[PDB]
Write a protein that binds this ligand. Structure first.
Ligand SMILES: [K+]
Ligand SMILES: [K+]
Length: 262
């Protein structure tokens, strides 16, 4: 109800490159507890919106995950994409930096001269990431169960026991991933979670970078990531089917769901 933004969704509206809202962005001038940041925001969402912090993979920078920023922002979210202090930071450090990025978004929401002054509902936050940034996002969810949603891609962690996660979590993995293979990372992670709404979606033919900037499946991946965040960060039941369904797309090679009603 009170958190619903924008028009009733359709498959076509969610598959398109952009949602209904106009997006601006800026570079964070003095990043506090992480390497660098870009904030993407809707100028005209018609109310406060939730915030999402996105962390790249091992060896990687904002470039790898930046497509998410405009894609989510255009549907009604403030999105911070980060660089980590070092490209070689591990999951534990990525989680800390991720939460520091959300904390800085909260500072900017309270700063009259900021472009996102008063645009964020600080009680509604989400976490995303690729690779070790995905591992880090699930760590964030374990330590901060009031986070509304997690959406991760080809997650990597040195352990797969995420039974601690009570946050609604969508896991993308990439069929042909040799670095964080579905069978030893994403799927055991998925299976460990007993306490939440969850979905597992394998993208056909995909390398480890199959959900990164420039990927050929942004219609499907974007639709799913946006629908998940809309259903869970906004309690927007107009998105329940888009969030919880298994798409019959020939680009989907596996789909598993629990505790997710259509
Ligand atoms: K932009
Ligand atoms: K600043």
């Amino acid at each position: 109800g009170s958190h619903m933004r924008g028009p009733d969704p359709t498959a076509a509206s969610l598959e398109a490159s952009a949602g209904p809202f106009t997006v601006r962005s800026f570079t964070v001038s003095r990043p506090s507890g992480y390497g660098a940041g870009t904030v993407y925001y809707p100028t005209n969402a018609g109310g406060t919106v939730g915030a999402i912090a996105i962390v790249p993979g091992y060896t990687a920078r904002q470039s790898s995950i930046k497509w998410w920023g405009p894609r989510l922002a255009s549907h009604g979210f403030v999105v911070i994409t980060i660089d980590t202090n070092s490209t070689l930071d591990q999951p534990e450090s990525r989680s800390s930096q991720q939460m520091a990025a959300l904390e800085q978004v909260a500072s900017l929401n309270g700063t009259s001269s900021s472009p996102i002054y008063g645009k964020v509902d600080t009680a509604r936050m989400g976490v995303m990431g690729w690779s070790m940034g995905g591992g880090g996002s699930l760590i964030s969810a374990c330590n901060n169960p009031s986070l509304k949603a997690a959406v991760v891609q080809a997650p990597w962690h040195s352990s797969t026991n995420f039974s601690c996660v009570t946050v609604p979590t969508l896991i993308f993995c990439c069929e042909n991933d040799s670095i964080a293979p579905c069978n030893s990372y994403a799927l055991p992670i998925y299976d460990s979670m007993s306490e939440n709404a969850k979905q597992f979606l394998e993208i056909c033919g995909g390398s480890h970078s199959c959900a990164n900037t420039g990927n050929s499946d942004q219609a499907l991946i974007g639709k799913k990531g946006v629908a998940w965040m809309k259903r869970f960060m906004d309690n927007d039941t107009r998105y329940s089917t888009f969030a919880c369904e298994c798409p019959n797309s020939t680009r989907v090679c596996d789909c598993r769901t629990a505790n997710c009603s259509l």
